[PDB]
């Protein structure tokens, strides 16, 4: 870089930069799906994976509320 003191105006210029200017927007669309999960029918009562699934199910119900399309 090159920085020059301009004594006439008590000011400074610093040159040697190169511009990177945004001229548009490019958009990609993603669709993420949860994998299939087998039913774990061996536990007594609450299974850890069944409750992890209904936990991710609730997280998605709440996430829906902030979706871009109405």
């Amino acid at each position: 870089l090159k920085e020059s003191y301009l004594e006439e105006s008590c000011s400074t210029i610093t040159e040697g930069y190169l511009s990177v200017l945004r001229t548009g927007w490019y958009t990609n669309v993603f669709t993420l799906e949860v994998g299939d999960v087998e039913n774990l029918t061996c536990t007594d009562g609450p299974s850890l994976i069944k409750t992890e699934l209904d936990l991710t199910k609730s997280a998605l119900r709440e996430l829906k509320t902030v979706s871009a399309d109405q």
Binding site: E3, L6, S11, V20, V34, L63, S67
Partner: protein, 352 residues
């Protein structure tokens, strides 16, 4: 002499009492072995299959978190910010995907290259928007910046107050030009604040909305400010203002009236007192500008340097062996002595 026979009789009867005794022994061992077979078969196998079940539950839970990391992470980020993301995170769009999209952008080969080189900037200057949750699918959109204009000469003007005095009276000129200038086709773009443009190496990335297109001749304000060709933006004041303005490669100091302005270094406090008026100093001339008792740093100050390594993770697998050879030796022994028992009573029944 046939009392002998009776002695043999008493002996055989005592014998058949011994056979019955060992027999009632075998019987008690058989009932004992029956409860051992049904302890292992029932109470032991069911406890193992219970643990086999919980194991598989936990395995499924952790596998679930593994096989769906991208999904779960994207959901997390959109939950922490309610639908929008400050940057295009790695989970929203992988590096491979970023490069594939940027190589498809509608611009020239070199601009595609530059974005490809600064994918960090592409990610931060872009963002992600949650479109909708449909059932178990989450659908979202990433918006990437298109850096179509690149490599044009760019510079930043900083300024301080220039006060003149004639017998206790002050005339103060101040440039109002200050900011970023980037050369463009048909104009030069002016960004009034330094935060309006971000510096990465020699490249300056700039928020498009902040830009103000100004006539090219405004450049002349940096050769002769008192130029008649352009309305150079300069403000006047009647009062002296002592201050510090930081440059990329140095700093401007304005000292007036009752202020003690100095440039200093680290270790040693002060190395030079500044004249009253406007002074320009380099990052390599000093490390500090002081205005009275307030100390201003010209560069970033290097602090500690830490290095931390996590605790080692070790295995807890300590399996079980069964001593099968020696045990099998005892069973080979038993089956041989049994077959020997049948053969000795075969000789006996052939002796009579």
């Amino acid at each position: 002499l046939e009392s002998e026979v009776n002695a043999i009789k008493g002996a055989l009867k005592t014998t058949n009492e011994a056979v019955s005794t060992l027999g009632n022994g075998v019987r008690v061992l058989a009932t004992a072995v029956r409860e051992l077979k049904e302890f292992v078969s029932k109470n032991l196998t069911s406890a193992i299959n219970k643990n086999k079940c919980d194991i598989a539950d936990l395995k499924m839970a952790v596998s679930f978190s593994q096989f769906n990391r991208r999904f779960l992470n994207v959901v997390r980020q959109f939950s922490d910010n309610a639908g929008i993301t400050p940057a295009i995170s790695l989970d929203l769009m992988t590096d491979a995907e970023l490069a594939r999209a940027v190589s498809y952008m509608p611009t020239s080969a070199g601009q595609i290259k530059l974005m490809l080189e600064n994918r960090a900037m592409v990610r931060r200057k872009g963002f992600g928007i949650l479109i909708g949750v449909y059932g178990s699918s989450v659908i979202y959109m990433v918006q990437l910046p298109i850096f179509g204009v690149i490599d044009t000469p760019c510079w930043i003007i900083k300024a301080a107050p220039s006060c003149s005095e004639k017998d206790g009276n002050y005339a103060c000129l101040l440039r109002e030009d200050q900011g970023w200038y980037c050369k463009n086709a048909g104009s030069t773009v002016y960004y009034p604040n330094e935060k309006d443009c971000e510096t990465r190496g020699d490249h300056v990335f700039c928020d498009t909305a902040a830009g103000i297109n100004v006539a090219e001749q405004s450049r002349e304000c940096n050769i002769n400010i008192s130029t008649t060709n352009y309305p150079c933006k300069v403000s006047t004041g009647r009062h002296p203002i002592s201050m510090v303005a930081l440059s990329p490669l140095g700093a401007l100091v304005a000292c007036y009236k009752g202020v003690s302005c100095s440039i200093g270094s680290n270790r040693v406090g002060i190395i030079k007192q500044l004249p009253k008026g406007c002074s320009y100093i380099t990052n390599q001339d000093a490390d500090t500008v002081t205005i009275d008792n307030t100390v201003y740093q010209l560069s970033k100050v290097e602090g500690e340097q830490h290095v931390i390594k996590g605790r080692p993770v070790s295995s807890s697998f300590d399996p079980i062996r069964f001593p099968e050879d020696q045990f099998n030796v005892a069973l080979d022994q038993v089956f041989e002595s049994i077959e020997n028992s049948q053969a000795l009573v075969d000789q006996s029944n052939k002796i009579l």
